[PDB]
Structure formats: structure tokens, C-alpha cells
RNA sequence: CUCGA
DNA sequence: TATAATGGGAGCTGTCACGGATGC
DNA sequence: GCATCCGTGAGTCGAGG
């Protein structure tokens, strides 16, 4: 929604992003034809 | 003759326009619809070459007869297509410009030649602070301007142009 | 994270756009372009490591 | 014998490969459901098991 | 910061000429100059108003240094380095070994150490830094040509700012930018941050990178095959 | 070391014009200007050379280059006898001369004080194929334009008239510049157009649209075909140097083979071609074997006339054009017979 | 590549293996005719197809490359002859 | 990048 | 071609040994 | 005379994509 303070106007549309790959039932996806795995990384915790 | 010895050394100015076949002028590379070399650009034939062998670019000449010859209408010398690995161009510097290798290679060759550090070499190449090649009888801080003095351009700009201020 | 990152880029192009164009007549589709979005998200399941 | 305007550049078996074909797929331009990249006018493929 | 000189008749410098103290401002000679400055003629005020400056030669870039090298007598510091050579200091004595080293390399050689400034930068054949068409009727190109045509863009951008008398601070900032791109094309990363194609985090491959390490020029290509 | 900050700092040197400096710069531009014309209606000389001599000695002796649409070559010695042509003039024509000195002072300080404002628009147009610096180059060029062009009497702040060729000059900078195959200004427009067309329509149906959607969208003169073509024509290089892997193992253009030198297969076939052709032309007489060579252009590249070989070997050209037919029968013949020459045909 | 019917890559080590075999000829074939240098593989390729012994090996092309790199970097290389005069390999090709 | 020696 | 508009905005950083200007 | 910041190397080939 978009709004004009001083007009107070107030305009609200839904508005298409594009779309988002979807995994599958056994947790891969399908990116351009070819099945991929985002393999999950291990880092250093946040903290101090 | 027999190679036996391969020497490197500097290209001088005259050198590298002794390499040059003609001066890259525009920034273009090919025409978006011929698909062909743009006029004094990056692939132009005129300077670098034939893309066929024994044929100039609008096609007056095409075959080894002429060879040397350099067509009139278009410009493309009638030779082989494989020169087009060979030919140099060249970029005529408006100002001229340092080669890194002489500035950055620490130590600077162009700094220790000079007696420059690596600081007032980059402020200098860089335009951070100007350096005196003749300072005309010039004085900043009672102390004359002496040669090779490294100004800032608060400094300069007070000894070449005056001191002044506006008030409001 | 990449989502983020698209998204980031989206809201600078809204900025971008809110700082033009009529001031009135704006829409939420006239300041949203979803490319640096989908091109996250892209770069994300086909170039990444 | 005039040359011919065309040549040959069909798609052949590569050095060691080769087997049975079981499936082909062909995909044209101007036709429903499909749309290639541009200057592609047509996109076959061949499967050899 | 300015000396005043009023003036009943024609006067025989403009604004913006430089002057030294005994210069005739005007009145045909009668209203000198007393300190060195610019002239200000202010036709108002009828005063020929002059402020203290000097017309001292100080430059930037490699212009100026193109001018302090090519200004050096390379025999006469080859002499005063060795008479450093004579000094009781080790430290000196290092310095002045180290300079004489670069001073007698180009000596020996027939070098001339102005020749470390570019005037004409060569341009690489073309076929070295392909624009070719692939399997799909792409294209695909060398970084040297964008390289070398951000060089193009800026040399000409400065021909042209310079032919219609730009201001100092714009030439300034063209020269920087064309140093700049020289440098990103001969070796780009090695100064400041590295020269990138649009939306892409990944350096294009300079003069000096397609030469050196692992992938360069002599390991991939001349030491095996 | 960061080059935007350097140069935000030097524009930081120059203070901001007051409505009264603003219009006083403006006001003796315009008057410098007029003096110029004038002083070229004195003089009989060319306002163009007169300008290029009072610019010369308002910047200096640094920068006196040769100007292309001069006719003379500017060097000092020429500036010195113009200057001393304006400076041997009575007193109420030699005022013009000061009249337009103070005008081009005023012209660079005038550029100089607005350089900011160049920034503040060049910001906007980032990400587009043009570094930061570069827009804000062009937009500099944009602003003197706005300069040269600006008239005070309107009273309108020099902003508002800047501000339209500095977005221009960008925006030509931008539509000039941006890619490596150069595209024409208007084709870019297109080509935007078209782009514009396609995310709205793509933002409507939820999905990408079809090259027919795109062109029921671009109105009459569009189809899909002139769609496709005209993306097919937008289309940008891309890198050899773009890895494959990672960047310490492999480049896009290891894959590229090249097509233009001969292949060694290639070069041999074509060798035994001339050899077996030389071999096959033995058999005939030497006249019928070098006219079938001037005919085809074996010998000097270049296919003769039945008039030139005939003129050649002092025959009529009716006679020529019967010993090339015998002569290829004979080959013909020859040739049945062997089968040497049969594979080469591909 | 197996996809694009590639050659065997003869690295650095290979190369050490054929020096210290004292493998001369073996060596300067690889490094010649079986990889860049055009009229060296083409008349390989012929005198093999006519049963003749392959010829002479020439310049390879990839020193012709680094050359021309090295002109790009303003630096002059040049081969010599025992006399110190130039040699050119580029055959007049470069030279105006 | 992942795999192989 | 004229309302006025006037200083950017990126930035996670877990190695190591040497030659170097330096610069403490 | 001694700690500090910078630039540079860090196995091979082969395969997939
Ligand atoms: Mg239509
Ligand atoms: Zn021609």
C-alpha cells in the first residue's frame, strides 16, 4: 500500500515478484530442468 | 637467420606509434546489424587487417593478385587474414599517463629515480597535491618555493591565484 | 539471505522511482520492478556454490 | 555439378557412444505451448539408451 | 589581499593577465605595477585592482612527472650518488646502492626513463581479444575490449572537455579517471578497487593477469601445452 | 584513494552561489558573449577565434591546444598576434575586450559553483552500464552546455535550466555508451520500450509473456516475429573469461573452437587437390592445360575473358572457347577412366 | 575434453620427464608440431598422409601471443640473431 | 565447485 | 531547451611467509 | 636498530556441469 502523509491518501494493490522455486517431496528442486540439492553450510555462531 | 638471444626493453612513444597501424579512435567494436567492423573502432580493418584472406571490406578486391595493394574505396590492405593477430593499434593520450608497473612495483622506479616516496608519488599521479617545476620567484610561509616542493591545493591555490575571503 | 539481498535492491529501485515521476499518480506497481528480485533468486539456485 | 546452397550439420552419434533410440522430442516455433529463444526455430532431442 | 591602481586613461592590460612588479598597467605608461599579481580590471570602479600572486609553473600527474624525468641528467646524479657512495652511513649508503642500481640500469641499457610515461598506449590485435560468434549465434568478447574502451571513452570525453575549456577541477577529475582506466587495463586490482563488468562482483582480466600465475600466459600455455 | 570522495571534497572547496552571485555571473556571461560579436564586428576577424584567444589568456599559458573547427592552429604565437590585434584598439572598443575577459571568468566560476548539483542528479542514474564517475563527467558536459545556453533575464534560478541538458547529456551518455555493440540512439528507445512493455504486461498476466502479447501491446507495425527480432538484436556479448567452475579452474572461451584457420585435414585435402589437378592438367597439351588455367584462374588468380586468353595466345576467341571445350573433354575422358578426381567433390 | 575431442594437456611435469629423459625431438614435437604451431602440424599432417618424415618444427604460435601481450604492455621483445641484429617471426606480417 | 587417481 | 532542484554508499573475513618501504 | 602493512605464492592430471 502506498500512502501519502500530508494527502493521507491511501492506495493498496497486490503486486506480481515473480516466482519462487518450490522443493520437492524428497527436498530438492527443479532449476531449469535439472534436479539440484542446496547443500547446508556450517559457519562460526553469531555471539560473543 | 637463427634466433640465439630474445632482448626486452622500454617502447618509447615513437616505438609504440612504429608498431601502429592506426589509431583506435572510437569506442566501437562491431555494427549490430552487419555484424561487421565499425569505422576506426576496436575490430576495424582498415587498421588491424583483413577477416578474409586476399579480400578488402567491401569486396573491390578479392583475390592474391593484389597483394600490398590497399583498396581505395574501403581502405583494407589486400593481404592475409592472419595478420589480424599481428598488427597493433594504438590510443593517442590526451594527457600523458603512468605505467603502473613503473609505480606500484615497490620500490617505484619512476619514485627512486626521482627521490619520491610511494605517498607523494600517488598524490601526485593521482592529482591529490601538485609538485613545482619552476616556481618563478613564488613564497609561501616566508620560506621562497623551492623546486620540486609538494603543495596541497589550499597552498596553490593562495600563491597562484591570491588570498581572499567574502564575508556576509 | 538471498531473498534479502533481492529485496534490498527492489526497495533502493523504489526510492529511486518514488524520487520521480508524477507525484500523484503512483501506484504500487508503477514503483515496484520485481527484476533484481527474481535475478537474486535465480543467481541463487543456478550460481551458487 | 553446381555446389549446393546447403551443407551438412546434423547432429551425429559422438566417437564410443550410440545404443537404441527410445525417445525423440521435437519442439517447433509457431506452434501451441511453445516459444524458444530468439533465431531458434526449432529444438530436437533425442534420447539413446 | 590586492593592490589598488586608479586609472583617467586607456588602460594596456586585461583581466586575467599575469604581471611583475615594473609592468605598465596604464595611462601610457604613467600607473605601474609595485608586487607580482593578477589583473583584475574593474571597469566600475575604474581601477586597475591587482591581486598578489605569482606565475609559479606547479602541475599534477604524469605530466609533471613525464617533466621531472625527462628534465634528469642521468651521468650527473650517477656522480653525486657515487660521492653518497663515500659516506660513513650505512643507511645512505644502502639508498644511494638501491638508486644507482635503477640510475645505471638505464644508463647500460639506452633507456630513457621518461619512457615509463605513456603518451600512445598499444592496442592488442584483434584476434588476441576475440569478438567471436558461438554455437547459438551469441556472442562472446575479451574484457580487454571493454577495457579498452572505457580508456577510449574517457581519453575522448577529456579531448572534448579540453577543446571547449572546461574548468580545473572537471579536467582534474577526467586526467584521474584516465590514469585510472590506463592502469585498469595494464594491470587492473593492482591500485584501488578492481574494474567489474555491470551487475557481475568478478574483476575483468587485465594485461597482467592474462601473463602471470597458474592460468598466465607462460605456465598454461609456454611451459606446457 | 577513493576517487568519488577526492572529488566530493574538491567540490566541497567551492561554496554555493547566492541568487544575487548567481545572476551577476550570468548577467556578465551574457554581456562577455555579445562583446565577442561585437569586438568580431570591429575586428572583421572570426568570434570563434576571438573567443579561443580571450579563454587562452583567462586560463593560461597550461592549456593552449589546437581547437577542430578553427581554421588557424592556436599556439601562443598566434593568441600574442590576436591579442596584440584586440589590444591596438581605440579605448571605447577596447573595452568589449575587457568586457568579454570578465565574461569567461565568470562562465568557469559559474560551472565550478554548480558542479554539485551535477552530483545530486547523477546518483540517480547508477547500475545502467556508466560507473558513477563517468555520469557524472557527462553531466559536467551537460551543465556547461546549460552555461552557454542560459539567459538571466527570465529570472529563473540557473538550477531549473541546468538541470534538463545534465539530465540529457546522462542520458545520451547512458544511450551511447552502455554497451559494447553499439546500438543507435532511437533503436535504444525501442528496445526500452519494448522491455517497459514486457514487465508491465508481465506484472498483468503473472507470468512472462509471449513475443504475440508483447507485440498486441506495442500497437500497429508489431508483430511477434518484429518482437523477436528485435530482442534477438538487443542482445549482449558475454564474456570469454566467465568461469566455469571457479575461477582457478576454467574460462568459457576453453570451449570455443576456432573455425577460421584450416583444420590440417583440411590443408592436406586442399594440397593433393592441387597436386592431382596439376597431375590430371599434364595430360593435355600445354595450351589447353594454361587456358584451362587463365579460364579458371589458376595462374594469376584471376579468371581471364575467352577475349584476354584469346588475345594471349593470338587466336579469335571462337578458337579460344574450342580448345577450353576439348580440353575439358579430354579431362573428362581422362577422368572416367581414373577416378582420381571424383572424391574431391564432396 | 572428451566433448570437444580434446588433446591430453603435456604440463610443466611432463615436460621435466622429457628434459630429464633428454628427450629433445620428443619434446619440441609436443611442444611444436602436435600443439601450436599451424604450418608445423599442417605439414606434419601432409608428410605423415604422403608417408614422409615430419618436417622441421617452426615457431609456435603462443610465443607469437606472448609477444604481442607483451607489446600491449609497452615492452619491447625481441628476438636476436648471434650478431645482436633482429629477427622477425612474424614474417614481415607486422611490420609496416 | 563436486568427483577420480 | 526555463518552477526549483547543489557532497555516494558500499562494507562477514577462520592462512602464511617474505621483501619493503618504513616508521616507530 | 626493531615491530608494522602490503603483496604473493600455496601438486597433477583427468571427469561432471
Ligand atoms: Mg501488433
Ligand atoms: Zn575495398
Redesign the pocket.
Known amino acids: 500500500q502506498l500512502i501519502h502523509k500530508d494527502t493521507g491518501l491511501i492506495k493498496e494493490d497486490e503486486v506480481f515478484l515473480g516466482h519462487i522455486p518450490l522443493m520437492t517431496e524428497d527436498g530438492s528442486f527443479i532449476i531449469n530442468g535439472?534436479d539440484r540439492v542446496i547443500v547446508s553450510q556450517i559457519?562460526?555462531s553469531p555471539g560473543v | 637467420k637463427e634466433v640465439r638471444k630474445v632482448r626486452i626493453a622500454l617502447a618509447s612513444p615513437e616505438k609504440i606509434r612504429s608498431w601502429s597501424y592506426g589509431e583506435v579512435e572510437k569506442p566501437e567494436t562491431i555494427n549490430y546489424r552487419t555484424l561487421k567492423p565499425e569505422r576506426d573502432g576496436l575490430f576495424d580493418e582498415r587498421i588491424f587487417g583483413p577477416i578474409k584472406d586476399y579480400e578488402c571490406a567491401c569486396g573491390k578486391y578479392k583475390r592474391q593478385r593484389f597483394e600490398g595493394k590497399v583498396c581505395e574505396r574501403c581502405g583494407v590492405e589486400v593481404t592475409k587474414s592472419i595478420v589480424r593477430r599481428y598488427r597493433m593499434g594504438h590510443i593517442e593520450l590526451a594527457t600523458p599517463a603512468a605505467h603502473i608497473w613503473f609505480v606500484?612495483d615497490?620500490?617505484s622506479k619512476i619514485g627512486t629515480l626521482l627521490d619520491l616516496?610511494?605517498?607523494e608519488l600517488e598524490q601526485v599521479l593521482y592529482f591529490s597535491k601538485y609538485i613545482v617545476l619552476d616556481p618563478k620567484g613564488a613564497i609561501l610561509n616566508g620560506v621562497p618555493v623551492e623546486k620540486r616542493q609538494l603543495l596541497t591545493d589550499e597552498e596553490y591555490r593562495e600563491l597562484r591565484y591570491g588570498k581572499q575571503e567574502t564575508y556576509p | 539471505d538471498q531473498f534479502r539481498v533481492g529485496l534490498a535492491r527492489l526497495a533502493?529501485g523504489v526510492r529511486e522511482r518514488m524520487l520521480m515521476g508524477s507525484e500523484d499518480s503512483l501506484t504500487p506497481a508503477k514503483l515496484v520492478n520485481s527484476r533484481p528480485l527474481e535475478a537474486a533468486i535465480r543467481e541463487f539456485f543456478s550460481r551458487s556454490? | 555439378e553446381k555446389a549446393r546452397d546447403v551443407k551438412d550439420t546434423s547432429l551425429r552419434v559422438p566417437p564410443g557412444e550410440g545404443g537404441i533410440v527410445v525417445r525423440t522430442v521435437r519442439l517447433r516455433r509457431g506452434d501451441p505451448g511453445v516459444e524458444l529463444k530468439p533465431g531458434v526455430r526449432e529444438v530436437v532431442r533425442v534420447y539413446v539408451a | 589581499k590586492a593592490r589598488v591602481y586608479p586609472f583617467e586613461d586607456d588602460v594596456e592590460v586585461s583581466t586575467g593577465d599575469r604581471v611583475a612588479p615594473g609592468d605598465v598597467l596604464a595611462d601610457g605608461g604613467k600607473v605601474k605595477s609595485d608586487v607580482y599579481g593578477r589583473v583584475e580590471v574593474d571597469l566600475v570602479r575604474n581601477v586597475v585592482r591587482v591581486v598578489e600572486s605569482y606565475d609559479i609553473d606547479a602541475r599534477m600527474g604524469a605530466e609533471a612527472i613525464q617533466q621531472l624525468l625527462k628534465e634528469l641528467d642521468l651521468e650527473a646524479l650517477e656522480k653525486e650518488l657515487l660521492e653518497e657512495m663515500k659516506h660513513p652511513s650505512r643507511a645512505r649508503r644502502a639508498k644511494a646502492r638501491?638508486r644507482l642500481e635503477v640510475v645505471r640500469a638505464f644508463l647500460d641499457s639506452g633507456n630513457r626513463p621518461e619512457w615509463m610515461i605513456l603518451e600512445a598506449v598499444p592496442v592488442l590485435p584483434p584476434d588476441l581479444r576475440p569478438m567471436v560468434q558461438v554455437d547459438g549465434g551469441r556472442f562472446a568478447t575479451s574484457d580487454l575490449n571493454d577495457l579498452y574502451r572505457r580508456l577510449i571513452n574517457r581519453n575522448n570525453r577529456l579531448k572534448k572537455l579540453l577543446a571547449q575549456g572546461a574548468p580545473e577541477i572537471i579536467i582534474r577529475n577526467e586526467k584521474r579517471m584516465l590514469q585510472e582506466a590506463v592502469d585498469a587495463l595494464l594491470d587492473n586490482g593492482r591500485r584501488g578497487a578492481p574494474v567489474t563488468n555491470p551487475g557481475s562482483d568478478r574483476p575483468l582480466r587485465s594485461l597482467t593477469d592474462i601473463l602471470?600465475?597458474?592460468q598466465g600466459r607462460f605456465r598454461q600455455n609456454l611451459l606446457?601445452k | 584513494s577513493?576517487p568519488?570522495?577526492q572529488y566530493?571534497?574538491e567540490?566541497?572547496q567551492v561554496p554555493?552561489?547566492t541568487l544575487e552571485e548567481?545572476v551577476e555571473l550570468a548577467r556578465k556571461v551574457e554581456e562577455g558573449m555579445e562583446a565577442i560579436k561585437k569586438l568580431s564586428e570591429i575586428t572583421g576577424l572570426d568570434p570563434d577565434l576571438i573567443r579561443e584567444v580571450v579563454r587562452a589568456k583567462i586560463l593560461g599559458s597550461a592549456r593552449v591546444r589546437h581547437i577542430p573547427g578553427l581554421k588557424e592552429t592556436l599556439d601562443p604565437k598566434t593568441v600574442e598576434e590576436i591579442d596584440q590585434k584586440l589590444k591596438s584598439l581605440p579605448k571605447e572598443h577596447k573595452r568589449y575586450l575587457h568586457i568579454a575577459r570578465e565574461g569567461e571568468a565568470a562562465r568557469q566560476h559559474l560551472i565550478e559553483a554548480?558542479?554539485?548539483?551535477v552530483?545530486?542528479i547523477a546518483?540517480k542514474y547508477?547500475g545502467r552500464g556508466l560507473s558513477?564517475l563517468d555520469l557524472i563527467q557527462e553531466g559536467n558536459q551537460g551543465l556547461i552546455r546549460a552555461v552557454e545556453?542560459?539567459?538571466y533575464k527570465?529570472r529563473?534560478?540557473?538550477?531549473?535550466?541546468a538541470?534538463?541538458w545534465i539530465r540529457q547529456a546522462i542520458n545520451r551518455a547512458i544511450a551511447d555508451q552502455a554497451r559494447t555493440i553499439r546500438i543507435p540512439v532511437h533503436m535504444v528507445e525501442t528496445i526500452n520500450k519494448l522491455s517497459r512493455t514486457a514487465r508491465q504486461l508481465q506484472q498483468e498476466l503473472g507470468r512472462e509473456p509471449t513475443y504475440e502479447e508483447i507485440a498486441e501491446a506495442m500497437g500497429p507495425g508489431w508483430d511477434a516475429k518484429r518482437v523477436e527480432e528485435t530482442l534477438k538484436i538487443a542482445q549482449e556479448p558475454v564474456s570469454l573469461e566467465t568461469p566455469?567452475?571457479?575461477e582457478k579452474?576454467?574460462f568459457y572461451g576453453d570451449f570455443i573452437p576456432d573455425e577460421h584457420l584450416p583444420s590440417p585435414v583440411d590443408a592436406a585435402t586442399q594440397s593433393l587437390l592441387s597436386e592431382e589437378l596439376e597431375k590430371a592438367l599434364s595430360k593435355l597439351s600445354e595450351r589447353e592445360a594454361m587456358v584451362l588455367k587463365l579460364r579458371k584462374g589458376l595462374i594469376d588468380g584471376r579468371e581471364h575473358t575467352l577475349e584476354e586468353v584469346g588475345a594471349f595466345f593470338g587466336v579469335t576467341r571462337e578458337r579460344i572457347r574450342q580448345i577450353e571445350n576439348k580440353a575439358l573433354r579430354k579431362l573428362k575422358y581422362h577422368e572416367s577412366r581414373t577416378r582420381k578426381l571424383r572424391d574431391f567433390l564432396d | 575434453?572428451?566433448?570437444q575431442f580434446?588433446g591430453?594437456?603435456f604440463?610443466?611435469?611432463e615436460v621435466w620427464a622429457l628434459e630429464a629423459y633428454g628427450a629433445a625431438h620428443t619434446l619440441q614435437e609436443m611442444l611444436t608440431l602436435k600443439s601450436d604451431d599451424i604450418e608445423g602440424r599442417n605439414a606434419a599432417y601432409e608428410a605423415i598422409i604422403k608417408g614422409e618424415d615430419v618436417p622441421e618444427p617452426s615457431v609456435p604460435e603462443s610465443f607469437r601471443v606472448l609477444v604481442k601481450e607483451l607489446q600491449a604492455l609497452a615492452l619491447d621483445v625481441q628476438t636476436l640473431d648471434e650478431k645482436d641484429n633482429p629477427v622477425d617471426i612474424f614474417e614481415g606480417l607486422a611490420s609496416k
Open positions: 535439472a559457519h562460526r | 606500484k615497490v620500490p616516496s610511494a605517498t | 533502493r556454490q | 638501491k602471470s600465475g597458474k606446457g | 577513493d568519488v570522495r566530493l571534497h567540490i566541497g554555493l552561489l548567481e554548480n558542479l554539485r548539483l552530483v545530486s546518483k547508477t558513477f545556453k542560459f539567459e527570465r529563473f534560478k540557473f538550477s531549473t535550466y538541470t534538463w566455469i567452475g571457479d579452474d576454467s | 575434453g572428451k566433448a580434446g591430453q594437456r604440463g610443466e611435469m
